[PDB]
Design a protein around this ligand. Structure first.
Ligand SMILES: CN1C(=O)C(=O)c2ccccc21
Ligand SMILES: [Mg+2]
Ligand SMILES: [Zn+2]
Length: 164
């Protein structure tokens, strides 16, 4: 239906092999009451490009922040505390969140804490009446075949931490 939120975020790739390197791609994300979808962004024409994927909101089980990477590259470094800066808002993406569904977690990186908060609040609103909402989550990333939080080697492993 109507677009609730539209933003440019980094999306982390779904790791095929535990030894394989991770890719972070800049995409346009759209949220409606029915779907969360992501697209290539056509910078030159200033519009969304081809659709890369879509998740029916009814399939989402959890939306929360993720503990940040311990040694991120400059593109994902958190700035020191304290009017929108045009360059940084499309170049730096330090604030990650996770959208958990049928196929496991999707990791998305926001340029600001405020924008991450807006997306987590709205996603929690659209999923509020879902039937498979979980009570537990993984506070840390699934990286190189295991969760950094609990060392579990299954992506579908029940969250190690109870949601507050
Ligand atoms: C679909 N897809 C891929 O195939 C890939 O390598 C990647 C990296 C980030 C986000 C999405 C991706
Ligand atoms: Mg536009
Ligand atoms: Zn865990």
């Amino acid at each position: 239906a109507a677009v609730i939120l539209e933003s440019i975020f980094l999306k982390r790739s779904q790791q095929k092999k535990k030894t394989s390197p991770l890719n972070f791609k800049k995409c346009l994300f759209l949220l409606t009451v029915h779907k969360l979808s992501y697209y290539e962004y056509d910078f030159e024409r200033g519009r969304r490009g081809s659709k890369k994927g879509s998740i029916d909101v009814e399939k989402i089980t959890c939306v929360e922040t993720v503990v940040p990477e311990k040694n991120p590259p400059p593109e994902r470094q958190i700035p020191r505390r304290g009017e929108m800066e045009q360059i940084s808002i499309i170049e730096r993406f330090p604030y990650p969140f996770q959208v958990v569904y049928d196929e496991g977690p999707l990791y998305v990186f926001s340029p600001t804490e405020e924008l991450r908060k807006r997306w987590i609040h709205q996603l929690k609103n659209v999923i509020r009446y879902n039937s498979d909402l979980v009570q537990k989550y993984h506070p840390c990333f699934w990286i190189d075949g295991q969760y950094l939080c609990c060392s579990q080697t299954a992506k579908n492993a029940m969250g190690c931490q109870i949601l507050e």
